[PDB]
Symmetry: D3
Subunit: 258 residues, 6 copies
Amino acid sequence: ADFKFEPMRSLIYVDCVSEDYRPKLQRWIYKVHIPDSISQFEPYVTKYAFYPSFPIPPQGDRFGYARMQLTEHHWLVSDLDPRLEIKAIAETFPMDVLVWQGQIPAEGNPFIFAFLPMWWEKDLKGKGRTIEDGANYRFNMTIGFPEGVDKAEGEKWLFEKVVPILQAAPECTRVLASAVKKDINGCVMDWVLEIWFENQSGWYKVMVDDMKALEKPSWAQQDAFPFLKPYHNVCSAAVADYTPSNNLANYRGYITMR
Amino acid sequence: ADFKFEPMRSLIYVDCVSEDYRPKLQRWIYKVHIPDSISQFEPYVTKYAFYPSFPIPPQGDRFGYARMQLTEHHWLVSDLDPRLEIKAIAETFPMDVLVWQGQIPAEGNPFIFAFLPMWWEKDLKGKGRTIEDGANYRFNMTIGFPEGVDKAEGEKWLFEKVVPILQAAPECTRVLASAVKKDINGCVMDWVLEIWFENQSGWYKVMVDDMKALEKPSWAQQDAFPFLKPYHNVCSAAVADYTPSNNLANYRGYITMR
Amino acid sequence: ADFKFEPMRSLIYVDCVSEDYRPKLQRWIYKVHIPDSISQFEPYVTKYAFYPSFPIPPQGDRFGYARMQLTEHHWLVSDLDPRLEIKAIAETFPMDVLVWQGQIPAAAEGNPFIFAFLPMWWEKDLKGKGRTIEDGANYRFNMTIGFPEGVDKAEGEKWLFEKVVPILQAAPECTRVLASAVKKDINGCVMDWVLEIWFENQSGWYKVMVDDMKALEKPSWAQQDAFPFLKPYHNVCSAAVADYTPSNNLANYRGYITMR
Amino acid sequence: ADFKFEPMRSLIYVDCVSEDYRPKLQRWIYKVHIPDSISQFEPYVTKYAFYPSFPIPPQGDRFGYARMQLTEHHWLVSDLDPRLEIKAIAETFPMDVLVWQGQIPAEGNPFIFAFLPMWWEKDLKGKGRTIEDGANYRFNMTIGFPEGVDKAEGEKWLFEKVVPILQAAPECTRVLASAVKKDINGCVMDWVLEIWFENQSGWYKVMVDDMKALEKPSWAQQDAFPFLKPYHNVCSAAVADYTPSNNLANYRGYITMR
Amino acid sequence: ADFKFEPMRSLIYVDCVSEDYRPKLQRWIYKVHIPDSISQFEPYVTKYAFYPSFPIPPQGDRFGYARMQLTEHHWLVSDLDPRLEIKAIAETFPMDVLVWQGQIPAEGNPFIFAFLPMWWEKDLKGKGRTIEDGANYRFNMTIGFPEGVDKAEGEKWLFEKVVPILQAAPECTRVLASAVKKDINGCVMDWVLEIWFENQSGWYKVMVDDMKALEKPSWAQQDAFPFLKPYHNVCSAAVADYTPSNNLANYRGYITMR
Amino acid sequence: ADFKFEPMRSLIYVDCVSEDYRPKLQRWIYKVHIPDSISQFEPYVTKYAFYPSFPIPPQGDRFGYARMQLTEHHWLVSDLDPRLEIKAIAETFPMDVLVWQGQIPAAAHTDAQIDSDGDAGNAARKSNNAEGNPFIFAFLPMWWEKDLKGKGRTIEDGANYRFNMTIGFPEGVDKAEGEKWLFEKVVPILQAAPECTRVLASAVKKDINGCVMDWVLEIWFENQSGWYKVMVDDMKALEKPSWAQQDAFPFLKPYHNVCSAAVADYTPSNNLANYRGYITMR
Ligand SMILES: [Cl-]
Ligand SMILES: [Cl-]
Ligand SMILES: [Cl-]
Ligand SMILES: [Cl-]
């Protein structure tokens, strides 16, 4: 009978693989997926928000850049408790939605649904920074090390090799990380970081030019950082501090422009 | 002392035993009861809603049909924890509310308030159905087998005898069930089912005529299905898929018509 | 490009001609028609609400009782301006809705869509001036009439206010009587008057609008034998409604959230 | 016939003549008045708000200081058009409210309900100031010259004698004024002004000490500025930039503390 | 004293001239502009909404493609009425914003703020279309014929040459147009059109490829359609059917992501 | 590790030490603090609310009367879990707020952010400057523990003057003796006063943030007059205990060992439901 109390913040990385698919995807998301979602989980989800992605930056393709948005949930219980499988009303969800997001063509790309605890486990740079300090270019990135790579070795590489370069860049204002909760849904990702910049240029200097300094790992799946396969072992997005799509509080139906 | 995380969904079957009582009962509910209620449980109830009952279908008097509404709470802790008995402000509660609901006559019917897990336990027909598939006539029935009936003999009857008639009838779109949490407020009921149709006529056809086929149990409290004493061992409502009285989000005070 | 300030309150009498249709009709209303309607007029309507019907009272059918709802708009401009015909997005409107509402039969006779415009404020207050919401719950009988073809309007008017109303006035069972003339200029609505007449309950409504009204002389223009002497759903429509509705749509709509 | 478009902002100056009345007056205002008011004008009043008064400063009694609030309305039609007299449901108004606000005595104070254009007619000091410039002590004052006093002679006094001193005082950051629309409801007041300060000390220095320099006019009803009979020909309140009681958008019923 | 009822819908084409300015401009718009704006016009503006631009399509540069948003207002009175110039709280508006939007440079582009009646004046293709007919790529374009060009010539060319190509394209689902109200704020534009396609490729086929057919007029400010100077004599944006930024209804302050 | 379920109601006694600070402190509260706060805890706080103070009554000073407001949070986890010390965006929280609330004396440089080693906010709410008054931030269970007078009173029974008071017994005073005193000498006088309509009490959850206070009580009246008649005039009857930090009841050092506010039944500042941004007056 007992359902465990399990506060988590989860992230889904939502791509759009053609600009021709965008109107339709965005339609589905806002006209259909929102009300289905709320209808199901209003009683045990405290927050449901979309953070629309900034335009893909140069070489964003290599970071598995989600060209549509990030979907953020805050959970009081595990969505993967199997007792939750049962829904009186199920979502409306055509095959097409996967085509649009890139999960299948018409291999594709996996669906990345990452669970984290609600507060960051590590604060590595920018402790104490307020909203009055200014507008942020928030690059959220999640990585998963390829098959047969020691998780401790990946971590050592991450925090003793990658992060230090972010700490050295004055153009990087904030670094946060949390370990992915793998027991929840067997997400392949192991880490979620958020790295902040003043703007797109800042982002480029650090994640492309500064990282050229890095040594190509033995397990490297691409040539340059992040050395992980785009959309499979690395997804990301750049977002603003604010989103008007805080959905449990603000959604009033699919109102159309006149 | 700790308070247990006990997420639940509860349902109250709120009758109205005379049309001349309707404006008064209804007034009290929407003008007084909502504010008192929200004031008390806002911090530990995630959803408070009323689902107004469709008008009483033929023979529904035999199923304990709640002529006013279904009342639905979603809890984070148990309302029956004795520490919750203390409140700064008690509900304003005129004794006439009990007359209006048929609790006393000015013999009377018991206050039915069933606790459940937030997710249905059994999914027996229509798995996969979405809102895109059309409007449902949702028939919510709760039952409690009489004193001195084996609960398992009754469980067995319910699911090996009754449910299959529902499964067989093309007029029924959906059958969900969940056992009543009996350890919370000694509710006399043992089960809650929601059984969907397309309309009142289909409900009648399946729940009256198809049910004729059932042999009458030895414990039967009336001659035909549900075989239980209306308002006492069976209550029910038929309701829409949508209610606009989702009270934590949409209550704006008792705004009077002009 | 000059638009008339034209504040008004309109009422639509929505019926549901069979219980089997109600789920489908109610769905459409709250799932489809609200958002389309809001999308269209949000900038020049200040309120937009539905008041569900209490269940149909006895002999309620002879009053053109709307078994679904009153739909109420407050406008700042006339919706029947021809410039307002054009809209980027048009209503999603299945033919079936006309079946559900009774406007056409299904495969015995079709009832018109009644859409009546009024001033925002009641024109005549004929009983119960000063009654507050503290005075108790109201059973609100909202009723619109339109005298049939060939009857002098002034004669009808005088009959309404010198014959019918004084019975409402006499009856202690009736707490309130309000009336307004229908703005007929706007959209040629067949109705001439709208009244709201209040009781404590259905029992009260019946005693007055049925039994007290038996004393009324049958008019020569009468379309049925007893008050209101007008053809149901064609020359009289009505509903009985509560003081409050949770369906104040501009303030309170959150999308079509489904029960679990 | 036509209803004229008439966009106006009204102010009402709500006193509370004793601290033992504050709980009852406030309860009536926020529990009964709001929803009676909203119910009536929701369709033709675009905004309805209360600005609680700041604690009455020294000598504020002499300015006819509202110890409850200012009550602001924005109208699209004149509330005084006779046809607006008729209303389904009447304001619930017990006589005590008059006692609480001092309309009827323990002599009475009149009820001061002044109509204005929605935009200030005169901007006399501090045009250009934004909210970024800091928190304002907003002293809203209405005055009405007494019977017999020539309206123009008074206007000239106000603008050529009184204002100049506000303009000299660097403690005052803003002076706005508008003639009262007398022709709506025969309000006795002639002008409403808002005069801003950093804080109470500032309001004092300027509106008491600096004003001692003015000569006492022949028509004076008291010895010191404002020279007008308190609560009868002069009312005021000091209020903050922001109120949480923007009622048309924020009221969600009389929810009570636990 | 009288104020004309002047219902109208207006549009601002908000560009953003470099991806490095986006965070800052976004922030200001949503953190500062919204609350300043609402404070000011809540009582006489019934709708205030932002529709963020879709990703600039190929050759959008040539259409004065606003890279940030359309800002949409619905007014009950004319903002240009000189009595509305007086405000108590002036908007916080550093000149930096004019740099982000491109009004001022490192040539300045003008600020295009076009007034219109609330309902489209010409329905030219696809009358009858509902939301159910599918998602729309909505291309809003405003054009101003350059100095010296007879205005009727301008119109004659628009509706006799340009629109028939839109009508001929099955890729184009809707054509709407309204004349700009010049008499309000001397906006240099003469027309606004919304032209719908299914997606970017449909938009490209018609607005770029099909238009090659048009004859270059004698006043052309650029070799190909729209034959007008970008951002000066033509602005445009492509937007979705829905926006979450319906600000009078949905703003709950500047909430930051966690 | 797991985060424990910990349903709690908490209160902060927010003072304003001079009227000239009021506009500034209010603006900061309403313009800056709310959004920062909501942003932080929206996913695990079910209710964030401000109950502004009624006017300070005669002799309120002696009860540590909070001249601005009560600040009420309802939590699903403990805000003092060390892991909640990490926040993407920290609170804009200048030192001025502490000057204005009386936590620290006036000085230059106070427009600056509070410099803490950990979080500026969590450490600001632990302020305990010798020359100021401490920051009183008391955690309670969500439901009142003891119901001592007035059980069953509804809102139809009338408007309430709700005097909310927290007290903590002085350094080295025996805690069980304080309790004994409170409930066998103080309460009885409340119970005897027909002018007191309600008495409610809960023990402060000390095991959370080290709050010095031991008790929170709410005591209802009809008005200032009745509040005074009972909390001042009736209370003269108490004997002065050996640990007394002032001559008269509550015998406790104001703003240090006693804090209080009187508030209404309703607030419009129920922040999770009602806040639409700092919308300014025209
Ligand atoms: Cl029987
Ligand atoms: Cl007949
Ligand atoms: Cl060119
Ligand atoms: Cl002392």
